Design a protein around this ligand. Sequence first.
Ligand code: MG
Ligand code: ZN
Ligand code: ZN
Ligand code: ZN
Lengths: 56, 263, 46, 56, 134, 33, 65, 84
Amino acid sequence: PSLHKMSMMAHRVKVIPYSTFRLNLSVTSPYNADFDGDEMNLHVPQSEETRAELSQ
Amino acid sequence: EEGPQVKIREASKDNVDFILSNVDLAMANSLRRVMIAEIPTLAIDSVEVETNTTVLADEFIAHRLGLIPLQSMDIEQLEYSRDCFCEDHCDKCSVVLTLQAFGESESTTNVYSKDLVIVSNLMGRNIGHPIIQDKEGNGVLICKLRKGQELKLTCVAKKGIAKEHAKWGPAAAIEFEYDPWNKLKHTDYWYEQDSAKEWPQSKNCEYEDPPNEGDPFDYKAQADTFYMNVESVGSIPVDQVVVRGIDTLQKKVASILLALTQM
Amino acid sequence: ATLKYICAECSSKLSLSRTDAVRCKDCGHRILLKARTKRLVQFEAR
Amino acid sequence: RGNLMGKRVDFSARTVISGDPNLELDQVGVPKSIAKTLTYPEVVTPYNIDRLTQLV
Amino acid sequence: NQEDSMIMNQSSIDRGLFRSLFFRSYMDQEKKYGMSITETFEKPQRTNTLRMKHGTYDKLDDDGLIAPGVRVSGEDVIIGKTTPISSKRDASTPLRSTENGIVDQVLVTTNQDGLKFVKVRVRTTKIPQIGDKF
Amino acid sequence: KVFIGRLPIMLRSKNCYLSEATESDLYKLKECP
Amino acid sequence: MIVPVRCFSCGKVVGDKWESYLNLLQEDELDEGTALSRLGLKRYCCRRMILTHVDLIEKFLRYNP
Amino acid sequence: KAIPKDQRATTPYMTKYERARILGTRALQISMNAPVFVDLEGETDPLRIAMKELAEKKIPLVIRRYLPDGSFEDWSVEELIVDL
DNA sequence: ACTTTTTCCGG
RNA sequence: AGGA
DNA sequence: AAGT
Ligand SMILES: [Mg+2]
Ligand SMILES: [Zn+2]
Ligand SMILES: [Zn+2]
Ligand SMILES: [Zn+2]
């Protein structure tokens, strides 16, 4: 859903094999995700400006 | 006699029961690993299908064929296809098997691993013969056909290790145990009332000495002596699953030593 | 050689063209299959 | 609500999520297929030019 | 295996564990337009229309159908069809862009009307991978 | 006497062929027993 | 649907043992427990492979073309 | 209307948002082939360059802080304290 | 007498 | 019609 | 399940 400011967070990409978005286990709680078939979205900033907003 | 000692308990076509003494656990385990996934075998790896009128699908049968165990005795004198210079395959690097089957019989017609014929030249070396351990001499059951059900295909078997596919598995289950009286305190026995009663004793308890409680914990104590049992699938013979493993590992260590010398 | 389409039940090869009627000869049944390519398929045994 | 406050967007990806204890808190595992599809527009600059041409 | 995840034995997956077949039946028919203005199951090319799919029409045979052995993949055309106008508009059915596999059964039949009815089955095996649910 | 439309029949019903069919008959009819 | 060659867990060739199992049951009148063990399947992974097998192939064969 | 420097009453410190928009803005300009105001001591990322430009308070930008009435306080990235 | 909301994502 |  |  996204009822939290913490339901949408900025991350460092790590290119890996296998079709799943991998994520650290401690970040499980803010999103509220379990790994029982849960899916997630990924948006990519296009500016060196929209990037600063994410990182900073 | 030397460094690590061996004392074989039971031997057969399919199983070696022995005891590995004066060895490091890390050594006996690296040895366990190697026998599972690093000894090369030979199995079907390309199935060009001509006609399939069966109840099973092309790839269902394909996958099945790779699991059929092939003679991998003189495997050491077959090149890995990658290392060979021919585009695709040749006699130097591959064994070519053909399989033709048809339901002539009004009853159900069975298709066995015996029904495989080597079409390639074997260069007089022991390889590609489907392992038939079967009493009636039939080997694996690949398929079943009714009447007009024909099965035509060609297969190319290649070198490969179990690390690449479990079909190149030279060994089945590898039994590994140490310290049947937990004298090392390497495990904490879960219980309801009594640890010793509720947990069944190992058969290997007989080959080691009971703890005798009126003695302090030997912290100084290290784990040596590993009650093992290796099972051959059929490809390589039991003894060789061991020997070949011992060798394979030495070769890995040597490659390091060698690659170290290049620098 | 040449067996364009096989009938779905009796499995008798037909080899008909576009405008040669979608039906079997002895039995009716317009079901008719396609008979596998002569351009042969190869699969890895994994 | 559906076309203005909310919007279907580009540079967006979605898949099944799976936990990884070897990833860092702030990193996200991105499958190659998705990294290979998602694209950032970088401006040819004297700093990047050399790297950029290699990727081109 | 943390948080409703699970570790599967790769050695097992290869030995045949949790493998499954998957079929998908693509279907089509020749549509008649009043004055006997039918569509045609054929392998098209240029010929005034140029409104055809990007996928390799080359897997098609002259009847506008793949044969039951052929390994298909992208948006490779499974059924080639054309509709003329007052000429070969394309009406070709490509393989679901997402999909890939081997043609299984191709069935050529008749519609109640008497129209060319086609059903194409495409098989694939699915091995247990990493995001796979159980 | 006179035709009055077509009634969709439910499988394995009195008016369906399959009711009056044996294992062998069904397999022959390409129907799962 | 046709006997799996080799047990998923350990890898012991198991595709041969089928008809023999079906015979130690029918002809030899034994129980499943003793039959599996005559065939030398001691680890439960191997045992379950044969014990729990549903040979569906035989039903598919009853269909004509 | 514009508040005179001597009469300014906002933070002498730079907001989290000011800093994030300055680095974004300088990174966008440095990336658009703008003149860089510091020795790029091996630096190749326009954000890292922008961060360095800010580190030595060498960014020629000015934050116009707007008040609810429309009136505003102009503060330089030079004068703004970066404790954050 | 009379109206309007209700978590997020293959055909 | 179905997932979280 | 509420509220002009
Ligand atoms: Mg969940
Ligand atoms: Zn060769
Ligand atoms: Zn017929
Ligand atoms: Zn087993």
